[PDB]
Amino acid sequence: MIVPVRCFSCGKVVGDKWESYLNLLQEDELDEGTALSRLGLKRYCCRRMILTHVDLIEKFLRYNPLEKR
Amino acid sequence: LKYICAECSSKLSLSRTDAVRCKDCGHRILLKARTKRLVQFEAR
Amino acid sequence: AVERKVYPSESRQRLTSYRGKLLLKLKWSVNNGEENLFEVRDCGGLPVMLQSNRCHL
Ligand SMILES: [Zn+2]
Ligand SMILES: [Zn+2]
């Protein structure tokens, strides 16, 4: 749903890396493997976490029962 | 203000034998609001 | 008190059925046309297929 905090296998913090990773692909126009490297994700353990994350939460958030649409 | 309208989202409260409906919309479906209360969890 | 649309989410939350009014135009013909009466009849709430030409989505 939202970025996981740690990499499942490494233990390495990964949750501070989602918003930046998107900005790398978007703004700096890098490919995925270059951007992952720039964020320090070396082990394929860790590259997998950010490479394949689906920010499904951003869908959930569009249904907010506490505001007049 | 215990309840919330499911359609217009107006926060509102009820009483003893009161119109089970939004006082703005007239929609007859109301969500019970989460109010300040202690629930305890273990971070595991 | 004039009609308002019902969307399927409401049906899901109320745990009832998502239905539209089924109307029949009844022809009541006396003596082979000599005198025929018409009346449109409310034949109940007919469950409607979601995302079809009778659904509001
Ligand atoms: Zn990893
Ligand atoms: Zn309302």
Instruction: Map out the domains of chain B as residue ranges.
Output: 1-44
Neighbours of A19 (CB within 10 A): 11
CATH number (3.30.413.10, 2.20.28.30, 3.40.309.10, 2.40.128.130) of B1-44 reads 2.20.28.30
Structural resolution in Å: 2.8
The residues in A 36-65 lying below 8 A from B, measured between CB atoms, are 65
To the nearest 5 percent, what fractions of chain B are helix, strand and coil? 0, 20, 80
The CATH number for A26's domain is: 1.10.10.60
* Residue entry with tokens 């009466």: C37
In B, minimum Cα distance to C4 occurs at B27
User: For tokens 């009014």, what's the residue?
Assistant: C21
Q: Give the distance (Å) from ligand 2 centre to CA of residue A56.
A: 29
**Six-digit token string for C54:** 């009778």
Cα A58 to middle of ligand 1, angstroms: 23
- Report the alpha-carbon distance of residue A28 to residue A38 in Å, rounded: 11
